C-alpha cells in the first residue's frame, strides 16, 4: 500500500531538482537580462542563442526528471520501453509545471538563480521567437496563483509522468494502477495542506489538461522554428522526445 508514497516522491523531488519553489521564491522575492548587451555579458544570432539556451535547460531538466521517475515506487519495475514512452510524453508537461516556480509577472530565473531575464525583453525578440515564453508566463501566473508548495508539486509531477493514456503503452493496466495510487495520495495531501481551498484538486486536474495543450502548441512553434530558421538545430535528446508527437 501507499502510506510511504508521498514521502518517497517528495524526497525524490528535493534530491533530484537543482531548482525548487522555496529556492526560486527567495531569490525572486541575480544579473538582469533586459537587452542585447546584458545577454552577451551573461553568455551566432541572438534569438537563436536563446533558443539554444532553453534546450540546454530542458536537457538538464529531463536528466533530473529521469532520476526522479526511477525513484517513483513501481516505475523502475515497468518495461524499459514503457519508461521511455512515459518520460517521452510527460517530460515537457512536467518542465512547464515546474518552470512556473521561477516565473513572476516581470520575468524568470535562469542560470540556476544567478540570472534573471525579463518578460519584456523576451516579448521583444523577432518573430517567431517572441512567441516562445509569453504563453508560459500566461500559464505560470494562473498556476502560481494556486499557491502550491513543493510537496504538492512533487505529487503533481509524479502524476503527470505515470499517465496511463500515453500512446503506445504496453502495460496500461499497471500504469493506470500506479496513477490511481498517486492521484489518491495527492487528493489527500491537498486536503490537509490546503484545507480552505475546496476545489484545489479539481483545479489541478484542469491544469494537467492545460499543460497538454501548452506542450502541443509549444512543439508546434518549435517545429516551425526548426524548419524555417537556418541556425536552429535541436539537441538529439529533444529531437527524440519531439519525434512522432503531433
Amino acid at each position: 500500500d501507499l502510506k510511504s508514497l508521498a514521502k518517497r516522491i517528495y524526497e525524490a523531488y528535493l534530491k533530484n531538482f537543482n531548482m525548487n519553489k522555496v529556492k526560486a521564491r527567495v531569490i525572486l522575492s541575480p544579473f538582469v537580462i533586459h537587452d542585447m548587451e546584458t545577454l552577451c555579458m551573461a553568455e551566432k544570432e541572438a534569438e537563436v542563442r536563446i533558443f539554444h539556451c532553453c534546450q540546454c535547460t530542458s536537457v538538464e531538466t529531463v536528466t533530473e526528471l529521469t532520476e526522479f521517475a526511477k525513484a517513483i515506487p513501481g516505475f523502475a519495475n515497468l518495461d524499459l520501453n514503457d519508461q521511455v514512452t512515459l518520460l517521452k510524453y510527460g517530460v515537457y508537461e512536467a518542465i512547464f509545471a515546474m518552470l512556473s516556480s521561477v516565473m513572476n509577472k516581470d520575468g524568470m530565473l535562469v542560470a540556476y538563480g544567478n540570472g534573471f531575464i525579463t518578460r519584456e525583453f523576451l516579448k521583444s525578440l523577432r518573430k517567431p521567437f517572441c512567441d516562445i515564453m509569453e504563453p508560459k508566463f500566461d500559464f505560470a501566473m494562473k498556476f502560481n496563483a494556486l499557491e502550491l508548495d513543493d510537496s504538492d508539486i512533487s505529487l503533481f509531477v509524479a502524476a503527470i509522468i505515470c499517465c496511463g493514456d500515453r500512446p503506445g503503452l504496453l502495460n496500461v493496466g499497471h500504469i493506470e494502477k500506479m496513477q490511481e495510487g498517486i492521484v489518491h495520495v495527492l487528493r489527500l495531501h491537498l486536503q490537509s495542506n490546503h484545507p480552505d481551498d475546496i476545489f484545489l484538486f479539481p483545479k489541478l486536474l484542469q491544469k494537467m489538461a492545460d499543460l497538454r495543450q501548452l506542450v502541443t502548441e509549444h512543439a508546434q512553434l518549435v517545429q516551425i522554428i526548426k524548419k524555417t530558421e537556418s541556425d536552429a538545430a535541436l539537441h538529439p535528446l529533444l529531437q527524440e522526445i519531439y519525434r512522432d508527437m503531433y
Binding site: 536528466t63 524499459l80 522526445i241
Partner: peptide, 8 residues
C-alpha cells in the same frame, strides 16, 4: 529512443 533509453 537511444538517449532517453540511455538515461533510463
Amino acid at each position: 529512443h537511444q538517449l532517453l533509453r540511455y538515461l533510463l
